[PDB]
Design a protein around this ligand. Structure first.
Ligand SMILES: Nc1ncnc2c1ncn2[C@@H]1O[C@H](CSCC[C@H](N)C(=O)O)[C@@H](O)[C@H]1O
Ligand SMILES: Nc1ncnc2c1ncn2[C@@H]1O[C@H](CSCC[C@H](N)C(=O)O)[C@@H](O)[C@H]1O
Ligand SMILES: [Mg+2]
Ligand SMILES: [Mg+2]
Lengths: 324, 324
């Protein structure tokens, strides 16, 4: 028989083979052994079940593994295979309408998407917190932070300059293809998911928002837009291509899971915001601006980022991006 | 302004940055200096124009660079930038309806797609040959050959076995996810474009068809299906995952451009035909079958491959694939 589930397995394969992500959760859960032992847990978006099994292994008395997509069936098999069917219960469907037999002492969730909020799953976690978490209960991870940095993307620089290198390799001048390539690769309003490294970072990364996930008002902050202003000074001479956005989350003890290009790579990579064309900058060129993360009005699952930026003495500009 | 041309630049970037492909054409054209010097050339599907410029640099008196897609505008700029606007003429639209002022002494074309015939551009080259090529004129490349080999895809083997390795890395048994992963990654009828190496090849590659591009009847062979039977003996014990198909083309002198996994990688990679699940084989396991390349009836641009195969003493089986 033929099945149409390639993407289902591949997304969960990518997450579990992400050792930074999976080991950070494993250890962040283990570090909360004191708060979980003999207690009850809700795993929001349990996927293949691995975080719910981690919670049971951390001492949890009972875990409700709630999963809306078709992969829930695999999670129930994984639970049984690990001998945990008496303590980890896999519940299909959205956490917003699942029926648990009790409120829970803790919620664990791997809810983050590209640019932190793509897929807009955080609202489901907060809904579950309001509906099912006991007063003073535990949320894992407990907080998120958002970061921005100006970038000179080395790979993009090579792709753009490639056309002027053709003469050196084939004896045909194609340097007029550079304006065309720049229009096509940068003159669009899509957020580009790409992994960078420290070689690409043009100034000290700036924290522009800090989200305490249990805080009053956050569900409404998410609808109005999460973000803030930033300011930085360029390290050296380079073409500025735009900005990279990334995040970390923290497990209280604390253990930090980072998606920074200065840190080990993860499947989240970074969310890149390209200007329409490169801007030359030098050492100590001042850059300031504002970043807002928003749901897109067409598809609230889809991340929108509104960028305001000012490079040196240029006028401030605005560019409105939506997830690729 | 925002443009929607990312894929246009990226496909031509991939071809020009493919040094195996581009240098083989450059040299295959140069090798025909005697047949091209002072003569006229039609470049079918000129793209960004580089092959037409190669022809002019090989001595051609006049080159008609015909291109149906929007990139034709870039080719006219490239021609002008190389000072060739008096001898290389860029004509937009399909070669089937272009008007040339003369018949031509030679046709050059980079028409090959994944699995050789995906995109079905060969029929356009043959149409142009019948309509515009002088009697006894030159076609570059002049021939193509098709190859098949049984494969044990090392990357696929790792992805499938990954689920049974989770216990060794996180202390959670996920080995039941293997049946699921196999269904999703192999239990489908799509041709998978993937680059392999010699490590993946399970028996001596077999040539199953040879296409002399100028031969009588080929346009009708393409509609009925191109291919033939094959037989081989496995090198050693391994899971058989299916078959890889690839091609070469030859420039008469001859210079061969190969897409074999035993040869330097190209952007064509190979076209992979996975069985529904792996079949264990051993040294000297006999494998035979037949491969037919066909246009898909829904979208004649889209390659279809009909596979018949017999592994050892198993019954012969059939699997009907269509391009991803
Ligand atoms: N409202 C909701 N209720 C239940 N599951 C949800 C949900 N919103 C998103 N999901 C699911 O949440 C999962 C997030 S991916 C994380 C999977 C798993 N916890 C792991 O860490 O490996 C996906 O499987 C997605 O289908
Ligand atoms: N019938 C047709 N007439 C004109 N161009 C065609 C065509 N069928 C396909 N094409 C074009 O043929 C090109 C094949 S890609 C090869 C591009 C170029 N010769 C190079 O080698 O770099 C594409 O640009 C495609 O748009
Ligand atoms: Mg995610
Ligand atoms: Mg091609």
């Amino acid at each position: 028989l033929y099945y149409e589930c390639y993407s289902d397995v591949s997304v969960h394969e990518e997450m579990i083979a992400d050792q930074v992500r999976t080991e950070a959760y494993r250890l962040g859960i283990l570090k909360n052994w004191a708060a979980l032992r003999g207690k009850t847990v809700l795993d929001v978006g349990a996927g293949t079940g691995i975080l719910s099994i981690f919670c049971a292994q951390a001492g949890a008395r009972r875990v409700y593994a709630v999963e809306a997509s078709a992969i829930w069936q695999q999670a129930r098999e994984v639970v049984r295979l690990n001998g945990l069917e008496d303590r980890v219960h896999v519940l299909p469907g959205p956490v917003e309408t699942v029926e648990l037999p009790e409120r829970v002492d803790a919620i664990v969730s791997e809810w983050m998407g590209y640019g932190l909020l793509h897929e807009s799953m955080l609202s489901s976690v907060l809904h579950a917190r309001t509906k099912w978490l006991k007063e003073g209960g535990l949320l894992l991870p407990a907080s998120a932070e958002l970061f921005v940095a100006p970038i000179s993307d080395q790979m993009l620089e090579w792709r753009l300059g490639f056309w002027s290198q053709v003469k050196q390799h084939y004896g045909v001048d194609m340097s007029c293809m550079e304006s065309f390539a720049t229009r096509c690769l940068m003159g669009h309003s899509e957020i580009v998911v790409q992994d960078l490294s420290g070689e690409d970072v043009l100034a000290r990364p700036q924290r522009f928002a800090q989200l305490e996930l249990a805080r009053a008002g956050l569900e409404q902050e998410l609808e109005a837009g999460v973000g803030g202003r930033f300011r930085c000074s360029c390290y050296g001479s380079a073409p500025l291509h735009g900005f990279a956005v990334w995040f970390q989350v923290t497990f209280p003890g604390p253990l930090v899971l980072s998606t920074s290009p200065l840190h080990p790579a993860t499947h989240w990579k970074q969310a890149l915001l390209y200007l329409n064309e490169p801007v030359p900058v030098e050492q100590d060129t001042d850059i300031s601006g504002e970043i807002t993360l928003l749901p897109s009005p067409d598809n609230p699952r889809r991340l929108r980022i509104l960028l305001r930026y000012k490079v040196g003495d240029h006028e401030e500009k605005t560019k409105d991006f939506a997830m690729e």
